[PDB]
Design an enzyme around this catalytic site. Structure first.
Site, short mmCIF file in Angstrom:
data_model
loop_
_atom_site.label_atom_id
_atom_site.label_comp_id
_atom_site.label_asym_id
_atom_site.label_seq_id
_atom_site.Cartn_x
_atom_site.Cartn_y
_atom_site.Cartn_z
CG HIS A 363 -0.33 1.02 2.47
ND1 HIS A 363 0.24 -0.79 3.06
CD2 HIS A 363 -0.47 2.13 3.51
CE1 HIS A 363 0.79 0.43 4.20
NE2 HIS A 363 0.57 1.28 4.51
CG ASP A 419 0.26 -3.59 2.85
OD1 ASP A 419 -0.57 -3.27 1.00
OD2 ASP A 419 -0.11 -3.07 3.27
CB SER A 525 2.47 2.98 6.81
OG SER A 525 1.55 3.57 6.97
#
Ligand SMILES: [Ca+2]
Ligand SMILES: [Ca+2]
Ligand SMILES: [Ca+2]
Ligand SMILES: [Ca+2]
Ligand SMILES: [Ca+2]
Ligand SMILES: [Ca+2]
EC number: 3.4.21.5
Length: 579
Positions: A363, A419, A525
């Site tokens: 992502h 991911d 992230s």
């Protein structure tokens, strides 16, 4: 308003503003507080279409209906014209709002309640929680008549009748012994013949099990990859592509060892156990670092354990929630920041995995709802950091990357499944005190980590807080934030969320207490979730950090994507350039 003799007595907001025609002034006289007063002003500008007559304005101030396009709508509908739940208005998850509560608070845009801040032709419209719909119009009841602003067509679940339900069993043994006739990959592109020149050349030195009679062109995984079934594709040399199959939920979480004795008391810690770790990639092509994984010279060579490691036992006092604290400098040599060259803006985080590879989430690289298309020359890495704000040339290093490989099963539209993104460092990185890779738990080692009672560790610098949690008051931290989170029970991880979470992700975090936003929404992230194995005193990184529901609403842990199914994957990349 008129009858100026009236402009002496104490005027009721109704008596001076409604049936007559007041400006902001007489209203303010009646009220005396610019906050609700300019709420009234926002209504008035909205009720510009509702100036006459009386009711037209009484209802307009009531707020129970949308005026056509809904610029007046102050209700609380959380469903689009198809019933799709709307995204957070203030935040940009998952699509960036062009006009938001910072721009047009006059329409009173709440958390996710249906709105219309830009006066677009769509009428009442909301950015939707599902990443598939950037902006969908909301069916809001019409002022004055039994109508709505846009046709309501809820997307009800399809019946199980017109579709032929397959009684066919889910694929066992991770697709090594699959016996179907599958001929479609992730992109739908058909495979080549197995005996082709390219396939033979690539699989000459690939560890395959010969027991499987490799069929004509069906999806076959003779290498026993735990992710699923895959086949070769044409194009560049060494390339491949996974297929689509209905796999069983054979998660390692519930796999209890067939050698775990039923004497789980007075557990034996690392007791002179020379626990060798078996490198799984090719050291010639993957590079060194796997052998030296999990050994910090400041810790392992000094026989020191970090002041946050003393909590690693889950046997603490009732397992009470503890907020994170600053760690020691040099205790995270692997933590890296994924940055933008132009402009120099904080984007994501990760951990260094080898002397040539950087592993991040899928992502972070590809998030099209933010106009993001990040290639080789638009991404950089900052390694060996203790502070973001300073230029630590001697310790922190700034590096570029050469090539980028994204996982075929990339599904960011629904749940950020798989991911996974692997980018090769452009320049060799020298091993030192502040530079180190990490270990990767297999199936049995990760199973032992999950069932023996060990806590995991997530390191991040709070980029997710700035990106996704638009609350003003919690800025970007200057120090590395390290959080210790044990493992979560699977029905607890699945029941409290509506989005189908795949077995390649898992929950991490303590039980959320009532009345707070939890601690699971701290860090960058793409961060690592590392757990220390008692056998060899080393740390294994289970996966990658991604977006979590705990940010946008309360009651959720951190959702992180596994990597133990990618070992056989990673090699398949390097053999492209390992000639
Ligand atoms: Ca008057
Ligand atoms: Ca008046
Ligand atoms: Ca009057
Ligand atoms: Ca007055
Ligand atoms: Ca007056
Ligand atoms: Ca009255």
């Amino acid at each position: 308003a008129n009858t100026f003799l009236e402009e002496v007595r104490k005027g009721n907001l109704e008596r001076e503003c409604v049936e007559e025609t007041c400006s902001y002034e007489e209203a303010f006289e009646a009220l005396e507080s610019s906050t609700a007063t300019d709420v009234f002003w926002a209504k008035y500008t909205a009720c510009e279409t509702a100036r006459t007559p009386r009711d037209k304005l009484a209802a307009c101030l009531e707020g129970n209906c949308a005026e056509g396009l809904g610029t007046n709508y102050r209700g609380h509908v959380n469903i689009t014209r198809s019933g799709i739940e709307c995204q957070l208005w203030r935040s940009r998850y998952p699509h960036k709002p062009e006009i938001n509560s910072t721009t047009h608070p006059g329409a009173d845009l709440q958390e996710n309640f249906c709105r219309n801040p830009d006066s677009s032709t769509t009428g009442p419209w909301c950015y939707t929680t599902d990443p598939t719909v950037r902006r969908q119009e909301c069916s809001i009841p019409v002022c004055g008549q039994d109508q709505v602003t846009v046709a309501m067509t809820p997307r009800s679940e399809g019946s199980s009748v017109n579709l032929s339900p397959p009684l066919e069993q889910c694929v066992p043994d991770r697709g090594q012994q699959y016996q179907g006739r599958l001929a479609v990959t992730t992109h739908g592109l058909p495979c080549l013949a197995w005996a082709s020149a390219q396939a033979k050349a690539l699989s000459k030195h690939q560890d395959f099990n010969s027991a499987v009679q490799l069929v004509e062109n069906f999806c076959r995984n003779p290498d026993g990859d735990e992710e699923g079934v895959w086949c070769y594709v044409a194009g560049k040399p060494g390339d491949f592509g996974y297929c689509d199959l209905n796999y069983c939920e054979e998660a390692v979480e519930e796999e209890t060892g067939d050698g775990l004795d039923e004497d789980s008391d007075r557990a034996i810690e690392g007791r002179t156990a020379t626990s060798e770790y078996q490198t799984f990639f090719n050291p010639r092509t993957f590079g060194s670092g796997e052998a030296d994984c999990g050994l910090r010279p400041l810790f392992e060579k000094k026989s020191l354990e970090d002041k946050t490691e003393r909590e690693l036992l889950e046997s603490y006092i009732d397992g009470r929630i503890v907020e994170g604290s600053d760690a020691e400098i040099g205790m995270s040599p692997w933590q890296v920041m994924l940055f933008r060259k132009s402009p120099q803006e904080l984007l994501c985080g990760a951990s260094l995995i080898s002397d040539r590879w950087v592993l991040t989430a899928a992502h972070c690289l590809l998030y099209p709802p933010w106009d993001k298309n990040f290639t080789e020359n638009d991404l950089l890495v900052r390694i060996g950091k203790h502070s973001r704000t300073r230029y630590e040339r001697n310790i922190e290093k700034i590096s570029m990357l050469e090539k980028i490989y994204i996982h075929p099963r990339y599904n960011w539209r629904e749940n950020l499944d798989r991911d996974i993104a692997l980018m090769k460092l452009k320049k060799p990185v020298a091993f030192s005190d502040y530079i180190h890779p990490v270990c990767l738990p297999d199936r049995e080692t990760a199973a032992s980590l999950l069932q023996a009672g060990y806590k995991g560790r997530v390191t991040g610098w709070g980029n997710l807080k700035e990106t996704w949690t638009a609350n003003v008051g919690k800025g970007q931290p200057s120090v590395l934030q390290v959080v210790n989170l044990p493992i979560v029970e699977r029905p607890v991880c699945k029941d409290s969320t509506r989005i189908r979470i795949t077995d390649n992700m898992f929950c991490a975090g303590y039980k959320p207490d009532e009345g707070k936003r939890g601690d699971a929404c701290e860090g960058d992230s793409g961060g690592p979730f590392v757990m220390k194995s008692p056998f060899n005193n080393r740390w294994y990184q289970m996966g990658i950090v991604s977006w979590g529901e705990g940010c946008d609403r309360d009651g959720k842990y951190g959702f992180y994507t596994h990597v133990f199914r990618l070992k056989k994957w990673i090699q398949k990349v390097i053999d492209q350039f390992g000639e």
